[PDB]
């Protein structure tokens, strides 16, 4: 009950300031031969949000709100655009299997 309420209070703050999502969901580039495969996703300031979205440790994001995360320049665009979005749809590869996960702010 209290974790759900805490997750709702984080979401509300993200809704008001979407870049705050990056305090909770950390992305770190994965490369193979100098090509970016995507971003390893890990929990940030309070892991409850990362957990609530359906993310697990070791997941690699390959698409985010329709942005192809193999594009070496796309992070520029992601950050420029985040404050304009009201959800995050993520496609992650998890032990070699893709999953779509979702949070509406």
Curated annotation (Swiss-Prot):
The keyword Membrane applies. Keywords: Cell inner membrane, Cell membrane, Membrane, Protein transport, Transmembrane, Transmembrane helix, Transport. GO terms for cellular component: plasma membrane; type II protein secretion system complex. One of its GO terms (biological process) is protein secretion by the type II secretion system. It is found in: Cell inner membrane. Belongs to the GSP C family. Involved in a type II secretion system (T2SS, formerly general secretion pathway, GSP) for the export of proteins. Required for secretion of cholera toxin through the outer membrane. This is Type II secretion system protein C. It comes from Vibrio cholerae serotype O1 (strain ATCC 39315 / El Tor Inaba N16961). The chain holds residues 204 to 305 of 305 of the full protein.
């Amino acid at each position: 009950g209290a974790m759900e309420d805490k997750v709702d209070a984080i979401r509300e703050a993200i809704a008001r300031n979407p870049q705050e999502i990056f305090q909770y969901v950390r992305l770190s580039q994965v490369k193979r031969d100098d090509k970016v495969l995507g971003y390893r996703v890990s929990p940030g300031k309070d892991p409850v949000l990362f957990e609530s979205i359906g993310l697990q440790d070791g997941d690699m994001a390959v698409a985010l709100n329709g942005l192809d995360l193999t594009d070496p320049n796309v992070m520029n665009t992601l950050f420029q655009s985040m404050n304009e979005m009201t959800e995050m749809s993520l496609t992650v590869e998890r032990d070699g299997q893709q999953h779509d996960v979702y949070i509406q702010f």
